[PDB]
Every structure is written in structure tokens, then in C-alpha cells.
Amino acid sequence: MTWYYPPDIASDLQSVNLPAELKGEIFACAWEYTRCVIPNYTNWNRYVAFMRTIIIGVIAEFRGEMVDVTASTSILGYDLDGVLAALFEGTPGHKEMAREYKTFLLITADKASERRDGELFRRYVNALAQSPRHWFRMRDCDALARFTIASALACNDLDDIWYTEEQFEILTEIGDTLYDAVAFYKHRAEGETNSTFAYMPEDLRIKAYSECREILWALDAAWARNPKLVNVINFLRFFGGPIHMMMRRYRFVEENLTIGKNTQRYKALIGRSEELMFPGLAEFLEVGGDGVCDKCRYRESYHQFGGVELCSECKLSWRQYLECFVERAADVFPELKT
Amino acid sequence: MTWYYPPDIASDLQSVNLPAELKGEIFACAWEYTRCVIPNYTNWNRYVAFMRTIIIGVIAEFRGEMVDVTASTSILGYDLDGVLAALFEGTPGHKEMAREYKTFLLITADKASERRDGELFRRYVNALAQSPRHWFRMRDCDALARFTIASALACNDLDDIWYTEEQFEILTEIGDTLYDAVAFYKHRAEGETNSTFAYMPEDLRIKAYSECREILWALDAAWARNPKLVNVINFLRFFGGPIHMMMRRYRFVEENLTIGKNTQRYKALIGRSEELMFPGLAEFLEVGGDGVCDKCRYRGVELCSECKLSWRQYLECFVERAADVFPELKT
Numbered sequence: 001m002t003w004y005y006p007p008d009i010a011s012d013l014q015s016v017n018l019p020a021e022l023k024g025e026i027f028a029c030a031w032e033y034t035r036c037v038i039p040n041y042t043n044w045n046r047y048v049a050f051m052r053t054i055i056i057g058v059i060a061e062f063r064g065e066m067v068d069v070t071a072s073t074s075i076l077g078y079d080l081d082g083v084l085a086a087l088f089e090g091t092p093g094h095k096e097m098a099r100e101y102k103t104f105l106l107i108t109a110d111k112a113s114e115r116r117d118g119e120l121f122r123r124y125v126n127a128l129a130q131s132p133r134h135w136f137r138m139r140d141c142d143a144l145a146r147f148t149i150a151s152a153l154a155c156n157d158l159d160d161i162w163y164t165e166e167q168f169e170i171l172t173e174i175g176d177t178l179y180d181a182v183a184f185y186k187h188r189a190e191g192e193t194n195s196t197f198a199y200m201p202e203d204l205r206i207k208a209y210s211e212c213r214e215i216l217w218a219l220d221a222a223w224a225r226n227p228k229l230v231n232v233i234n235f236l237r238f239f240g241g242p243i244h245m246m247m248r249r250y251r252f253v254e255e256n257l258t259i260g261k262n263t264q265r266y267k268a269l270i271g272r273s274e275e276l277m278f279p280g281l282a283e284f285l286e287v288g289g290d291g292v293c294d295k296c297r298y299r300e301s302y303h304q305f306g307g308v309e310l311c312s313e314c315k316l317s318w319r320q321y322l323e324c325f326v327e328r329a330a331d332v333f334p335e336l337k338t
Numbered sequence: 339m340t341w342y343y344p345p346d347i348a349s350d351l352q353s354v355n356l357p358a359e360l361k362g363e364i365f366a367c368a369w370e371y372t373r374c375v376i377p378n379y380t381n382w383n384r385y386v387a388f389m390r391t392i393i394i395g396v397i398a399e400f401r402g403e404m405v406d407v408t409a410s411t412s413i414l415g416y417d418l419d420g421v422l423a424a425l426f427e428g429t430p431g432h433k434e435m436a437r438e439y440k441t442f443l444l445i446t447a448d449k450a451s452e453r454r455d456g457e458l459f460r461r462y463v464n465a466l467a468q469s470p471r472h473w474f475r476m477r478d479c480d481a482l483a484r485f486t487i488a489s490a491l492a493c494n495d496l497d498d499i500w501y502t503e504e505q506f507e508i509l510t511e512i513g514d515t516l517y518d519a520v521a522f523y524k525h526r527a528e529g530e531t532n533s534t535f536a537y538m539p540e541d542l543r544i545k546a547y548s549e550c551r552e553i554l555w556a557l558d559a560a561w562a563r564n565p566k567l568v569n570v571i572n573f574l575r576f577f578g579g580p581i582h583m584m585m586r587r588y589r590f591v592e593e594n595l596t597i598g599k600n601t602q603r604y605k606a607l608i609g610r611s612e613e614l615m616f617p618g619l620a621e622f623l624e625v626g627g628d629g630v631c632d633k634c635r636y637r638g639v640e641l642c643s644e645c646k647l648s649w650r651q652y653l654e655c656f657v658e659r660a661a662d663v664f665p666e667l668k669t
């Protein structure tokens with residue numbers, strides 16, 4: 001396996017002590033993922049900037065101690081605010097997407113370090129189980145799903161396209177449900193905190209893929225004749241499982257071409273929430289951080305999922321929320337009712 | 339489960355007696371295939387023209403009797419040459435792509451009808467096994483591969499991009515190998531005449547997918563900073579397996595989100611070669627028709643030990659042949 005990627009990023013990470021071999025695999029992952037889920041572009045500078053947000057994120061996912069968004073320094077030799085400005089300067093969601101990405105670095109770096117055992121990560125894992133709507137919003141930011149919808153419009157110079165909050169919530173729910181359904185087994189093997197069907201009932205995993213895919217086709221059909229909006233649908237379609245066959249990050253080939261097998265720091269970051277946290281996350285962490293249910297089983301710190309275990313009365317509410325996805329979709333996207 | 343597709347094609351096939359639910363299924367298939375392997379467009383008119391070629395093709399592929407390019411009239415209520423001009427007028431391969439398509443209609447509708455037993459089809463299936471280069475050229479046309487590369491350029495108003503014969507051959511070999519690797523099982527339980535790894539040793543299936551996927555990543559890299567060539571790469575990448583997860587035609591849900599389980603007629607049509615057959619097919623049929631190898635078993639053809647190894651060396655050779663054809667891979 002040779003690692004192929006544009007030379008623009010081939011001398012990235014000069015300040016960073018990792019094997020050249022590993023820099024290679026990281027650069028390739030950012031290229032592969034960018035080309036899979038933003039398969040069209042008009043703006044090379046934004047494309048590469050997006051690639052650089054994936055380079056930092058890949059590193060954060062497996063060596064949290066190397067990435068500290070709180071230090072407000074160079075991150076891995078990159079000036080993060082300026083990379084974020086190259087990407088989104090003059091798009092509707094610049095400031096909010098800079099928050100989305102910093103939240104992703106903060107949480108992913110904590111999860112992939114000692115700091116996993118700290119207050120921020122405990123509050124976050126607990127806050128995931130607050131509610132099914134809360135789950136999908138945090139999972140959105142963990143997967144950079146609305147960040148990548150914003151990035152796909154930006155990289156095609158669509159600086160005038162945007163969505164309501166509820167519209168982002170439906171689009172990312174479709175994307176994340178589709179991915180999380182295909183990535184189930186892989187996520188379990190890893191002991192993930194962040195996988196839809198650690199929380200959502202396993203017996204709905206096939207039905208929920210099917211429903212999401214179908215709605216996606218329905219919105220796609222409704223958006224016909226506007227080729228700009230194809231960049232949003234393509235993100236979700238290509239992210240929602242297909243990347244498992246396409247990216248060397250995954251083991252389709254290896255598996256013989258088959259699919260299916262310190263409370264101060266918290267309070268300081270909460271005070272920096274306008275900088276570091278997506279709109280609403282600080283509230284999510286204050287309300288859900290300690291658990292919201294007496295029967296749900298929390299751990300004192302964080303071939304099985306590593307998160308909160310929902311009690312069976314909570315799981316019904318999760319089941320029921322999944323089961324009214326079509327109505328919740330048609331609701332924010334009236335064009336589906338037609 | 340209901341069928342979703344732009345309302346532009348929702349009243350196609352008014353001349354065709356089929357249940358509205360099968361029309362719906364066919365419209366969905368064409369809409370879903372188009373969006374999957376041509377994920378961008380600028381030219382909606384050309385995009386609908388492409389969907390309609392897929393609509394006709396879906397119907398040829400399961401009821402050959404309902405499609406006859408030979409009869410020189412409208413096909414399933416479409417003016418075929420008109421859909422093809424809507425798609426390709428001003429593009430560099432209009433005449434060739436029209437011949438390409440017509441060959442697909444000719445061979446697909448024979449395969450899926452009584453004509454399956456004719457000289458023309460008998461010669462075509464023997465011609466598949468002439469050589470591995472021949473297989474990939476004919477598989478190309480059976481899958482509308484280069485037809486779809488051309489349509490991806492057209493649907494994005496790239497009226498001036500084209501490839502040499504050699505360059506299409508490699509591009510479609512990438513796509514057809516990736517697709518045929520993944521679709522192996524779907525095709526074994528179908529008894530396809532047209533599957534790569536019925537000819538290519540089955541053990542190279544995994545290697546080949548890997549290597550094709552690796553070359554497609556190398557090509558993608560080389561073509562960086564030229565957004566218009568993404569439409570070529572995107573076709574091969576999304577055609578080559580990922581459609582099994584994305585289109586309802588396939589069984590990803592139903593399999594629990596898993597992948598991996600007369601001679602007068604013949605001579606009349608050769609006489610209409612410039613109209614009905616891709617450049618060179620006539621020859622492939624003339625020379626290949628009665629088999630090429632004393633040892634190979636003809637009547638899909640079953641290859642001898644000598645031939646099977648020659649095909650092996652042709653697969654193993656792929657990187658060299660791609661780099662030969664596309665200097666951009668060497669660097």
C-alpha cells in the first residue's frame with residue numbers, strides 16, 4: 001500500500017514528531033475522506049484547508065496529548081483560526097463552524113488521552129444520553145457532519161446556502177444513522193462512547209438505515225434541478241456507509257471485500273464556551289453532565305460500548321424518536337410531504 | 339418503501355403496458371444510478387436525457403422482447419437518436435457513444451429474450467473470451483462504462499474533454515474490475531456471461547479490487563487542482579462497488595447491511611455496423627465468433643489452463659498498462 005494525496009499537504013506537520021510513514025497514512029486519509037464525501041469542488045484553497053481540518057482530527061482521534069485546542073497556539077504547526085478562515089471566511093456559518101470544530105478537537109483529544117478520565121469527558125458522555133435529540137446533535141459535532149455540509153458548500157463557492165438548526169439536525173441524523181448502522185461492529189470492537197446503536201435499539205439498526213436512505217432519496221428527488229444542493233445530499237450518501245468500501249482507513253479489502261464482519265478545567269472551558277463549544281453544548285453539559293434519570297446506569301468515569309447504559313423506560317423513548325423520524329423530517333422539510 | 343425520482347420522468351413510458359409500480363421501480367433505478375455515478379451536474383436537460391437511456395436499458399435487461407434497436411423506430415415511446423442528441427450534441431464522441439449505446443441495446447435485449455439462442459449472441463459470448471483486453475472492451479459496452487464517462491462530462495458541460503481509445507480501455511477496466519469484484523456473488527447466482535471473475539481466476543478478485551482502488555487513488559492525486567476531471571474519477575469510484583450500498587436495485591438492507599453474501603440476421607446487423615456496433619465489434623465477432631483456441635470450451639465460455647494463465651499475466655500487468663497509458667502515475 002502506497003499513500004497517495006496532493007503534494008500541497010506533503011510537507012505538513014514539520015514541527016510534529018511522528019514517523020514519516022505515519023504522516024503518509026494521515027495525509028492519505030484526509031485526501032481519501034475529502035474526495036469521498038466532497039466529490040465536487042470549485043475552490044482548491046478551501047479543499048486543502050478542509051483537508052487540514054481532517055489531518056488535525058485524524059491525529060486527535062489516536063493521540064490526544066499532541067492536540068490541545070485550549071492552549072491557543074499552533075496546533076500541529078497549523079494556525080487553526082487562519083485555516084478555518086481560508087475554509088469559511090465569507091460563508092454564513094464561519095463563527096459557528098469554528099466553534100463546532102474546536103468542540104470536536106476538545107472532546108476527541110480528551111477521549112484519546114489520559115484526560116478521558118476527567119470531568120469534561122464524564123459530563124460529555126453523560127450528556128450524550130440526556131435525550132435522543134441531544135445524542136444526534138453531539139454525534140453530529142463528533143463526526144463533523146454539519147461542519148462537512150458547511151465545508152462542501154464552501155468548497156463549491158456556495159457562500160449563500162444555509163439551513164435552519166432543525167434542518168441541520170435532520171440532515172446530520174440521516175448521515176450519522178446511516179454511518180453508525182454500518183460502523184456498528186467496528187464501533188463495538190473499539191468500545192466507542194459515540195455510536196447511534198449503543199443507545200438506539202439494535203433491532204432497529206437495519207430499518208433505520210433503510211428509512212434514512214429512503215428519505216435521503218426523497219429529499220434528493222425534491223431538490224432535483226438545483227445542482228448546488230447535490231453537494232449536501234452527496235455528503236450524507238457517501239459518508240453514510242460507502243466510505244467503508246472506498247477509504248483504506250477501513251478494512252473492506254482486509255475482510256475479503258465484505259461489510260458486516262478536575263472540575264476547574266470544565267468550568268474554565270465553559271467560560272470559554274463562545275470560543276470552544278458549539279451553540280448549546282455548555283447548557284447540554286450543565287443539564288446532562290450528572291445524568292437526568294435514576295434508572296439509567298452512569299459510570300463515575302469513562303466487545304461492548306463504553307458509554308451510559310440506558311434503562312429500558314428511556315430506551316422506549318429512544319425507540320419512539322427513531323420511529324417518528326419520517327414525520328420529524330417532513331416537519332422541517334415540508335417539500336417531503338408533497 | 340416507495341420509489342423516489344424527479345417528476346420529469348414520472349410520466350415516461352405512457353406507450354408501455356407495465357404496472358405503474360414497476361414503472362416507479364424503473365424510474366427510481368435510473369434516478370438512483372444517475373445521482374450515484376454522476377454525482378455532479380450543470381445541465382439538467384442532458385441529465386434527464388441520461389436517465390432515459392438508463393430507463394430503456396433497465397427494460398432491455400429484463401424484457402428484451404420490448405426493445406429492438408434494429409426496427410429503426412421509437413423505443414418504449416422515446417425517440418432514441420433524439421435522447422442521444424440531447425445528451426451528446428456538441429460533445430466529442432456523439433457518433434461513437436450512439437453506436438456504443440445501440441450495441442448495449444442490441445446485445446442486452448438479445449441476452450434477455452428468445453434471441454439469446456441466435457448466431458449474433460453465440461458469436462458475442464465466444465468473442466468475450468478471445469483475450470482479456472477484448473473482455474474488458476466488451477464488458478465496458480455491456481456496462482455503458484465509457485458511455486457513462488462521456489455522459490458525466492456532457493452532464494457537466496465539459497464538451498471538450500476526451501480520452502484516447504487506450505485511456506478509456508484502462509479507465510473502464512478500473513471501474514469494471516472494482517464493480518465485478520464486489521458483484522461476484524450477485525453475478526454467480528445469476529449465471530452471468532458478463533462477469534470479470536468468471537474468466538479471471540477467482541483468487542485474484544481481492545488483489546485486483548485493491549490494486550484498481552490504489553491506481554484510482556493515484557490518478558485522483560495526479561489530477562488534483564483540476565476539478566473537472568473529478569467527474570471521471572467519481573464515476574469509477576461510485577460505480578465500482580459503492581452502488582451496492584446506495585441503490586434499492588441491490589440487497590444491502592435485505593442482507594442485514596452486509597456485502598459479500600438465423601445467420602441471415604447476424605450478417606444483416608454486421609452490414610449495419612457503422613450504425614449498430616461500436617468501432618471494432620464487427621471484427622471481434624467475425625474473428626472471435628467461432629472461438630480462437632483449440633483447447634478452450636465454446637458452445638459464458640470456459641477457458642483452458644494456457645489461456646487462464648495469459649489472462650492472469652494480463653491482470654498482474656495492470657499497473658504497467660495504466661502507467662503506459664497515463665504518464666501521470668509513474669511520478
Ligand SMILES: CC(C)=CCC/C(C)=C/CC/C(C)=C/CSP(=O)(O)OP(=O)(O)O
Nearest residue numbers: 033054057058061142143144179183243249
Ligand atoms: C475528523 C473525523 C470526524 C474523524 C477522523 C477519522 C475520519 C476522517 C474518518 C472518516 C469519516 C467518519 C466516518 C467520521 C465519523 S467520526 P468516528 O470516530 O465514528 O469515525 P470511525 O468510525 O472511527 O472511522
Ligand SMILES: CC(C)=CCC/C(C)=C/CC/C(C)=C/CSP(=O)(O)OP(=O)(O)O
Nearest residue numbers: 371392395396399480481482517521524532
Ligand atoms: C445501464 C446498465 C449498464 C444496466 C441496467 C441496470 C442498471 C442501471 C444497473 C446498474 C449499473 C451497472 C452496475 C451496470 C452493470 S451491467 P450487469 O447486468 O452486469 O449489472 P448488475 O449487477 O446485474 O446490475
Ligand SMILES: [Mg+2]
Nearest residue numbers: 061190192194
Ligand atoms: Mg473513531
Ligand SMILES: [Mg+2]
Nearest residue numbers: 399400528530
Ligand atoms: Mg444484470
Ligand SMILES: [Zn+2]
Nearest residue numbers: 293296311314
Ligand atoms: Zn433512564
Ligand SMILES: [Zn+2]
Nearest residue numbers: 631634642645
Ligand atoms: Zn484457450
